[PDB]
Symmetry: none
Subunit: 270 residues, 2 copies
Amino acid sequence: KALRPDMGYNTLANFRIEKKIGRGQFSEVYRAACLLDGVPVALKKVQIFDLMDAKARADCIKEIDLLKQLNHPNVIKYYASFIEDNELNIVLELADAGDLSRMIKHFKKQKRLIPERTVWKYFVQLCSALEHMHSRRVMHRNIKPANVFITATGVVKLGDLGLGRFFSTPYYMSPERIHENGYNFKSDIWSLGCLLYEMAALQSPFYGDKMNLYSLCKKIEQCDYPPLPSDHYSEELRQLVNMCINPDPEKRPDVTYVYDVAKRMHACTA
Amino acid sequence: KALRPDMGYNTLANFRIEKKIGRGQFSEVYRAACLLDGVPVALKKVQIFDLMDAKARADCIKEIDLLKQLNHPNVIKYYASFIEDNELNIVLELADAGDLSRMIKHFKKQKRLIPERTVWKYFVQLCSALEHMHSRRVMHRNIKPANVFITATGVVKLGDLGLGRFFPYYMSPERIHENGYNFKSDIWSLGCLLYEMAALQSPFYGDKMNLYSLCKKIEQCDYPPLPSDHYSEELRQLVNMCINPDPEKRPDVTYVYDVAKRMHACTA
């Protein structure tokens, strides 16, 4: 099909698909380049007709409409969404950045810890991102190290694809997932708490080895995680983690509060 | 006009107009509130059926469709555009805090120069915004301190109050020759704005300023040189190449962004 510059990012003719890089319940994801400007992008084809009922389709369209309105230094961009060839086509940023997963297993090999000062540098940006998202009534739904990208310069980008430009049972299970299959805005806070623990501890709070799913549910119920070392990490980091990893969603702080703490701690640690 | 959550940001019903904040040749801008999320927005109403012929209507629609694709932290986001009550309605990111115009005046009244460190801190963000617009083949057409918003956190938001892009603050040579507006016309504006950040006045400003003297000063690019004691050769040379009568010899925004990024990294 022939180029149509008037359409910009809103037609498949302006993209060359490279390879499939992902399959989901409802979607396939590709690496593509825009033909107008040569920018590498992720192209998510969602079967809103062939794989969803009417309720799923409408809710998914509403959600993508909100996501492509976000405009924040620390969020992976949704560049476009349009219907063509009977699918919802979503064009997303692939960032020139490593995922926090990679950085974590790096420090692990080198038997070193991320100093509290760097942790706050990264965590304040994630919190800035999530505050932006919750202010437009958008839940993230999969906060994990694989979805957090860090640039050359140390700017954080939160995505939901787990795919950078160059390198690539949900990861942190909440009590409300275990018990009621529920996910709300406070479920993002739970995950954010677990990610702050993982940056300091270099492993998930509910990690273990053998690990029955049943043992993993028992530990989550009791919030039974190894305490962080009080010699390496302030009481205010360890407390923020404890407030976030709370079995009751209602008792977890809102992201405004977590962002405010991250901002005070960035300020007094830099 | 009563609520409809299903219709989203795409009908006037889900918005309360709170006051006018802008007026252009073909448009009014309002501060408004989304009743679905309590988020405050700007609402531009464009008179595509009363002040416009078919050509201008079709051009203005094509442009709005390209503008709503822009997505950059330093560019005012366009959330939605729809036709309702016989206008083209646009729902935009509101930047209701300050702007470069208010900052420049603040420094002017305090009889203080803006430190070069601070100039690059704001200027690299404006360059970032414009590199994004140009990469998508979108001209700004109305670059001036008042259209450069600044959030509480000090994030630059490049906007356009009253779509002055369809119609200046910075008389360019390609206005004096009537010649019309292109990508390198944005670069002229950009160089004048950098100058004004360092001098606290437009490069062609005068007390008893009048069209004759202005046309002469643009013809010769006659602006008071910046104090070499306060502002680097790099900053002065970057102003110098942008303020050039020939659009084809002005640098492209990628080059200006690259210098700004490198000058920012150095002075911090």
